[PDB]
Amino acid sequence: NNPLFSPYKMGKFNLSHRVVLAPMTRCRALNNIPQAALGEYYEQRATAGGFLITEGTMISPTSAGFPHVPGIFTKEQVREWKKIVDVVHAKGAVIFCQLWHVGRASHEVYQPAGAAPISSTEKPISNRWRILMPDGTHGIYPKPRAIGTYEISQVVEDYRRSALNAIEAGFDGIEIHGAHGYLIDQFLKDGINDRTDEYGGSLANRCKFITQVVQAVVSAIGADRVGVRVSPAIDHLDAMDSNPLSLGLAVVERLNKIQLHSGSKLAYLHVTQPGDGSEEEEARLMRTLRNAYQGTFICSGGYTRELGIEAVAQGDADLVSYGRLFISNPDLVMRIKLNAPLNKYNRKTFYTQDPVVGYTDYPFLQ
Numbered sequence: 183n184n185p186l187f188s189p190y191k192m193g194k195f196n197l198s199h200r201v202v203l204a205p206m207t208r209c210r211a212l213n214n215i216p217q218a219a220l221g222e223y224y225e226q227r228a229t230a231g232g233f234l235i236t237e238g239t240m241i242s243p244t245s246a247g248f249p250h251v252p253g254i255f256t257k258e259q260v261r262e263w264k265k266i267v268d269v270v271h272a273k274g275a276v277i278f279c280q281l282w283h284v285g286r287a288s289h290e291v292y293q294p295a296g297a298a299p300i301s302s303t304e305k306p307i308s309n310r311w312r313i314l315m316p317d318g319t320h321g322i323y324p325k326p327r328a329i330g331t332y333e334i335s336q337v338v339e340d341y342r343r344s345a346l347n348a349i350e351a352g353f354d355g356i357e358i359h360g361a362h363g364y365l366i367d368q369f370l371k372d373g374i375n376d377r378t379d380e381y382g383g384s385l386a387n388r389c390k391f392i393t394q395v396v397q398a399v400v401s402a403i404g405a406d407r408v409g410v411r412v413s414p415a416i417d418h419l420d421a422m423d424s425n426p427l428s429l430g431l432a433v434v435e436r437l438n439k440i441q442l443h444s445g446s447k448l449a450y451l452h453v454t455q456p457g458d459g460s461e462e463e464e465a466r467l468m469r470t471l472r473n474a475y476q477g478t479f480i481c482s483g484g485y486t487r488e489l490g491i492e493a494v495a496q497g498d499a500d501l502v503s504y505g506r507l508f509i510s511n512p513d514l515v516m517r518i519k520l521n522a523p524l525n526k527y528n529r530k531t532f533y534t535q536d537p538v539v540g541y542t543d544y545p546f547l548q
């Protein structure tokens with residue numbers, strides 16, 4: 183009866199249901215190397231024909247702003263990801279790697295040689311926000327270095343090489359992290375991008391970086407293995423746009439044009455929202471971006487079982503991603519299918535390093 187359990191064709195991938203694991207940073211990938219613990223964690227959540235998105239994954243030595251997040255820029259990282267991808271595929275699941283650059287949302291402790299983080303801008307995140315340090319304290323975001331356009335093209339190549347590494351590890355595809363005030367969003371949002379060259383100012387200029395990143399990974403691995411995540415109206419790390427709907431529609435137009443020029447559709451567009459009870463206004467934004475995009479749409483942010491069912495039933499979205507409920511409900515798909523009670527999550531262990539505690543020790547349904 184439940185449309186969340188109707189099958190869906192995501193490009194080449196035949197999904198058996200519409201419940202998606204949203205990407206979440208958990209900081210168990212010690213020294214940026216995927217660990218056996220990650221394999222247990224993703225395997226617990228994998229289902230036959232279900233779609234998983236990994237935690238954000240570094241594309242370069244300078245792309246991190248969290249401790250013990252995995253990378254996919256070295257061959258050592260590729261070898262260890264392969265072991266995780268294999269156990270997920272042994273469950274019949276489809277898995278994409280999220281490619282993540284934090285831009286100015288970093289700190290000397292996270293950068294090679296303690297160098298400054300990079301951004302569209304030379305302005306620091308304001309002291310309204312604090313960065314989680316490796317010792318569990320909260321530190322001050324430093325002044326970033328505004329990069330020139332050659333360096334922009336080098337970052338684009340980091341995305342491209344990371345996408346090829348993800349394919350080498352056996353991932354089904356990659357997702358571009360263009361959300362939450364990180365590097366791509368620092369170019370998109372006119373509340374951050376103060377550039378006066380061809381990457382700042384107009385909507386077209388502000389959309390150049392995400393267009394070039396998506397085009398590069400499309401050319402390398404094929405559009406149907408590329409998803410794109412954005413958040414036009416999440417206020418995180420001083421990310422704000424004067425006209426969020428207009429910015430979101432401008433991004434969607436770029437994606438439609440990339441598809442037209444390459445003769446193929448992307449895997450999906452993934453839009454995430456605050457989702458913390460603004461409900462009607464947020465729902466209208468989500469539906470407006472979905473209606474403008476020629477392809478598969480994943481909605482994200484505060485969805486419940488009931489709101490996910492409604493989203494698919496009403497044609498508002500094709501797939502529904504869940505984040506926090508998947509932390510504490512490894513069998514979330516099954517609980518949603520059965521309408522079984524959901525278990526709470528322990529916020530304290532979202533970002534700790536233990537390979538079991540708060541990570542793989544949340545039980546299945548009895």
Ligand SMILES: Cc1cc2nc3c(=O)[nH]c(=O)nc-3n(C[C@H](O)[C@H](O)[C@H](O)COP(=O)(O)O)c2cc1C
Nearest residue numbers: 204205206207237238454483484485504505506532
């Ligand atoms: C601990 C935690 C880590 C997260 N890490 C990421 C991440 O690496 N990349 C990303 O795009 N979103 C990340 N998110 C955001 C989630 O993917 C999701 O969009 C958000 O939690 C809202 O969905 P929900 O209400 O279902 O939890 C994270 C969220 C949490 C709580």
